[model samples]
Target: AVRIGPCDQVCPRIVPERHECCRAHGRSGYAYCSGGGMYCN
Candidate 1:
């Protein structure tokens, strides 16, 4: 899992970097964030 610390703030919307990370991991179409953590499922 991706590590998100308290110092990191959650993004209100999907960013280009996260989009690329999701796509590279073979994930697309749907995604969510918990606190500052991101998951594409």
Candidate 2:
């Protein structure tokens, strides 16, 4: 699932490649993931 986690928190999930900030948050440098192909909330 897509999650808005903190920059220091570890992500226990998966993320798609097409995500805007797949590798990391575009602004905060945090990590984000997609939820079964669903868009951000």
Candidate 3:
């Protein structure tokens, strides 16, 4: 079982190779993880 964190924080509990940031909300960097699949907003 994988642990997905909030968009404001890291996710996937541990990314393998896909560390590519994605769209999200925030001032500086909004690119965060989505869920188990390890996605960003």
Q: Quick one: best lDDT, which candidate? A: 1
Question: In model 1, where do residues sit more than 4 Å from their true spots?
Answer: 1-14
Tell me the tens digit of each residue's lDDT in model 2 across 1-41.
34443422333333333343434554433333444332233
Candidate with maximal TM-score: 1
lDDT value, candidate 1, whole model: 0.49
- How would the candidate models be sorted by lDDT, starting from the highest? 1, 2, 3
lDDT of 3 by residue, 8-38 (tens): 2444334522232232322232334443343
Q: For candidate 1, write residues 1-41 as lDDT tens digits.
A: 44333112333444665556556656662266666466565
> All candidates' lDDT scores?
0.49, 0.37, 0.34
RMSD of 1: 5.4
True-vs-predicted CA distance for residue 17, candidate 3, Å: 12
In Å, residue 17's CA in model 2 sits off its true spot by: 12
Between candidates 1 and 3, the lDDT winner: 1
The TM-scores of all predictions, comma-separated, are 0.45, 0.16, 0.16
Give the lDDT of residue 14 in candidate 2.
37
Backbone clash pairs in model 2 (N, Cα, C under 3 Å; residues 3+ apart or in different chains), count: 0
